[PDB]
């Protein structure tokens, strides 16, 4: 049976590099400009410049969310965008530094991206088991890293298992500097997320995607 187990893992984990694509873009320069510019963020959002909903702030981790943001709503699934101008619009550097460049090597089309979320994570930082929600955004997923070296988890039924009977089913290498992108099997058929023991120093990713034009609202 744990034969079988580790094969279907195997052919799983194939169908999950399929849908992934990454590419190191960013320099260490560029790396360090821009994360001069996430410190800003946290230092705007701490002396409260920002709306309530842009701010979302948690143990080992806060998200800042920019253009488009969602929350669960009283109860398609239960994910709902916030009301339009709830959250803070995209900074430009992120359009200059980030989304261009991203756009120039021909990673997503000019005009994708109309949401910007930066995860910044300590050291132990966790996220649950999900899928990006398919009825807020369109694919693909992209997502860029800084600060330090990590991973991202895919396939994360362990996390509801004991210790010792399960693990992910991809640990996908994610350094700084890198962009991923998922589609297909990595993006809707699968979910993704984040374990503690692979957040080893800070780490922020700045994650990009369009929202659906019928994406409901709260
Ligand atoms: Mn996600």
Same mark, same amino acid.
């Given at each position: 049976?744990?034969?079988?187990?580790?094969?279907?893992?195997?052919?799983? /984990?194939?169908?999950?590099?399929?849908?992934?694509?990454?590419?190191?873009?960013?320099?260490?320069?560029?790396?360090?400009?821009?994360? /001069?510019?996430?410190?800003?963020?946290?230092?705007?959002?701490?002396?409260?410049?920002?709306?309530?909903?842009?701010?979302?702030?948690?143990? =080992?981790?806060?998200?800042?969310?920019?253009?488009?943001?969602?929350?669960?709503? /009283? @109860?398609?699934?239960?994910?709902?965008?916030? +009301?339009?101008?709830?959250?803070?619009?995209?900074?430009?550097?992120?359009?200059?530094?980030?989304?261009?460049?991203?756009?120039?090597?021909?990673?997503?089309?000019?005009?994708? &991206?109309?949401? !910007?979320?930066?995860?910044?994570? @300590?050291?132990?930082?966790?996220? $649950?088991?999900?899928?990006?929600?398919?009825?807020?955004?369109?694919?693909?997923? &992209?997502?860029?890293?800084?600060?330090?070296?990590?991973? =991202?988890?895919?396939?994360?039924?362990?996390?509801?298992? +004991?210790?010792?009977?399960?693990?992910?089913?991809?640990?996908?290498?994610?350094?700084?500097?890198? $962009?991923?992108?998922?589609?297909?099997?990595?993006?809707?058929?699968?979910?993704?997320?984040?374990?503690?023991?692979?957040?080893?120093?800070?780490? !922020?990713?700045?994650?990009?995607?369009?929202?659906? =034009?019928?994406?409901?609202?709260?």
């Amino acid at each position: 049976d744990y034969e079988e187990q580790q094969l279907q893992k195997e052919e799983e /984990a194939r169908k999950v590099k399929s849908g992934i694509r990454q590419m190191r873009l960013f320099s260490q320069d560029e790396c360090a400009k821009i994360e /001069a510019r996430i410190d800003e963020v946290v230092s705007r959002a701490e002396k409260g410049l920002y709306n309530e909903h842009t701010v979302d702030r948690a143990p =080992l981790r806060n998200k800042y969310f920019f253009g488009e943001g969602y929350t669960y709503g /009283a @109860q398609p699934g239960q994910e709902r965008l916030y +009301p339009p101008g709830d959250v803070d619009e995209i900074p430009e550097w992120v359009h200059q530094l980030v989304i261009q460049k991203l756009v120039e090597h021909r990673v997503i089309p000019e005009g994708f &991206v109309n949401s !910007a979320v930066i995860n910044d994570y @300590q050291p132990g930082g966790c996220i $649950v088991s999900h899928v990006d929600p398919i009825h807020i955004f369109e694919r693909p997923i &992209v997502s860029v890293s800084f600060f330090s070296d990590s991973a =991202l988890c895919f396939g994360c039924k362990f996390q509801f298992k +004991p210790i010792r009977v399960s693990e992910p089913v991809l640990s996908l290498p994610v350094r700084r500097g890198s $962009v991923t992108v998922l589609s297909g099997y990595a993006a809707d058929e699968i979910t993704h997320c984040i374990r503690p023991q692979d957040i080893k120093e800070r780490r !922020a990713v700045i994650i990009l995607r369009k929202t659906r =034009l019928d994406a409901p609202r709260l």
